[PDB]
TrEMBL record, chain A:
Family indicated by similarity: Belongs to the influenza viruses hemagglutinin family.
Post-translational modification comment from the UniProt entry: In natural infection, inactive HA is matured into HA1 and HA2 outside the cell by one or more trypsin-like, arginine-specific endoprotease secreted by the bronchial epithelial cells. One identified protease that may be involved in this process is secreted in lungs by club cells.
UniProt protein name: Hemagglutinin
Organism in which the protein naturally occurs: Influenza A virus (A/Anhui/DEWH72-02/2013(H7N9))
Function per UniProt: Binds to sialic acid-containing receptors on the cell surface, bringing about the attachment of the virus particle to the cell. This attachment induces virion internalization either through clathrin-dependent endocytosis or through clathrin- and caveolin-independent pathway. Plays a major role in the determination of host range restriction and virulence. Class I viral fusion protein. Responsible for penetration of the virus into the cell cytoplasm by mediating the fusion of the membrane of the endocytosed virus particle with the endosomal membrane. Binds to sialic acid-containing receptors on the cell surface, bringing about the attachment of the virus particle to the cell. This attachment induces virion internalization of about two third of the virus particles through clathrin-dependent endocytosis and about one third through a clathrin- and caveolin-independent pathway. Plays a major role in the determination of host range restriction and virulence. Class I viral fusion protein.
UniProtKB/TrEMBL annotation, chain B:
Record lineage: Viruses, Riboviria, Orthornavirae, Negarnaviricota, Polyploviricotina
Subcellular location per the Swiss-Prot or TrEMBL entry: Host apical cell membrane; Virion membrane
Stated family: Belongs to the influenza viruses hemagglutinin family.
Segment of the intact protein contained: 340 to 509 of 560
Gene this protein is translated from: HA
Organism: Influenza A virus
Name of the protein in its database record: Hemagglutinin
Disulfide bridge map: C144-C148
PTM comment, free text: Palmitoylated. In natural infection, inactive HA is matured into HA1 and HA2 outside the cell by one or more trypsin-like, arginine-specific endoprotease secreted by the bronchial epithelial cells. One identified protease that may be involved in this process is secreted in lungs by club cells.
Assembly mode: Homotrimer of disulfide-linked HA1-HA2.
Length: 53, 170
């Protein structure tokens, strides 16, 4: 049990090229998406345990 | 050093000198007087600050994150990453230590060099009007006062005027 549940939901991802088509076929047990995401530009990403300034 | 002027035949330096780096110290009839030489000082200084300018600046090249501190990565790729980073870190440590060691060697030998260049400048101003001490002094033979000395330290010294006396006093 994890948070009192024994189920799991695991996530997969792929980058669809512009002017491409993704196609799902499914029989069940599928956690469907509602919104594709797009990247805005450039950024940095860090891991820390101190405050911003 | 390589030139044997600083810590060579010049026994030591002058803690009292705070005007520049290298200088003159004379003891004539009108008492002792000492003051610094600006051209050599500004030469050595401009060179050492040239080294600093070449060193003190940073690359624009940006590195991303390839691992994770909170949630460790897969074991094999993590050991390859740590192996690569350790090898690079080793390389940069070697490059740094070698760089600093050689920049210090060269710096020291360069100040030594500028000293030898000043001594050999004056030695050629006083063509036959002086004799080589051996401890970086110039035994003049004619009666050089506190104004003829200031004509040395401006290189305005004419050796032909005072040649007769110093020659005869050989
Ligand atoms: C992608 O391009 C091809 C040919 O260039 C076209 O047949 C297809 O319909 C395009 N896809 C979209 C989503 O417009």
């Amino acid at each position: 049990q994890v948070n009192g549940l024994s189920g799991r939901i695991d996530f997969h991802w792929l980058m669809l090229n512009p002017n491409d088509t993704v196609t799902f076929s499914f029989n069940g047990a599928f956690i469907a998406p509602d919104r594709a995401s797009f990247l805005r530009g450039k950024s940095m990403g860090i891991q820390s345990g101190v405050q911003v300034d | 050093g390589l030139f044997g002027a600083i810590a060579g035949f010049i026994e030591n330096g002058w803690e009292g000198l705070i005007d520049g780096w290298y200088g003159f110290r004379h003891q004539n009839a009108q008492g002792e007087g000492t003051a610094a030489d600006y051209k050599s000082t500004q030469s050595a200084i401009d060179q050492i600050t040239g080294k600093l300018n070449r060193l003190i600046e940073k690359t624009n090249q940006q590195f991303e994150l390839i691992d994770n501190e909170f949630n460790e990565v897969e074991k094999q790729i993590g050991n390859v990453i740590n192996w690569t980073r350790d090898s690079i870190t080793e390389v940069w440590s070697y490059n740094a230590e070698l760089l600093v060691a050689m920049e210090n060697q060269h710096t020291i030998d360069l100040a030594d060099s500028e000293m030898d260049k000043l001594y050999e400048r004056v030695k050629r101003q006083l063509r036959e009007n002086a004799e080589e001490d051996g401890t970086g002094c110039f035994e003049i033979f004619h009666k050089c006062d506190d104004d003829c000395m200031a004509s040395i330290r401006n290189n305005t010294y004419d050796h032909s005027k005072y040649r007769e006396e110093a020659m005869q006093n050989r």
